[PDB]
């Protein structure tokens, strides 16, 4: 039963830090903002960038 | 004590994947960017979109 706690405390060492990539988040946010911008431009006919 | 292991395995079956919505994140980011833009415009008098 001692090696049960051996593994439990060994794997408790796991870092509670999950690093998430910012580039993909930024690209997704940009795409969603572009979708919103296209929607708004369509609602105003063509009185926008295109 | 076997059903302890059975239930714990069945619960380990769970997928460690949590999808998070992108439209809400994009809207929050857009609102915060609008707040920052308004701050910068105010600090520059009115030499901006408004």
């Amino acid at each position: 039963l001692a090696r049960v706690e051996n593994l439990l405390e060994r794997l408790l060492q796991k870092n509670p830090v999950i690093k998430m990539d910012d580039k993909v988040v930024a690209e997704v946010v940009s795409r969603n903002q572009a979708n919103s911008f296209d929607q708004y431009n369509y609602t105003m006919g063509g009185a926008a960038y295109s | 004590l076997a059903r302890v292991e059975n239930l714990l395995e069945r619960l380990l079956q769970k997928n460690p994947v949590i999808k998070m919505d992108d439209k809400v994140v994009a809207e929050v980011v857009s609102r915060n960017q609008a707040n920052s833009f308004d701050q910068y415009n105010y600090t520059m008098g009115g030499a901006a979109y408004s």
Partner: peptide, 27 residues
């Protein structure tokens, strides 16, 4: 008892990975 140990080890090992899927890409 040993089965409890192995199950807990595997459970935390799987938990390490975590999710946070944007739409399909990871993080």
């Amino acid at each position: 008892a040993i089965l409890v140990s192995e199950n807990g080890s595997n459970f935390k090992i799987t938990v390490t990975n975590a999710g946070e899927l944007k739409a399909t890409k990871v993080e």
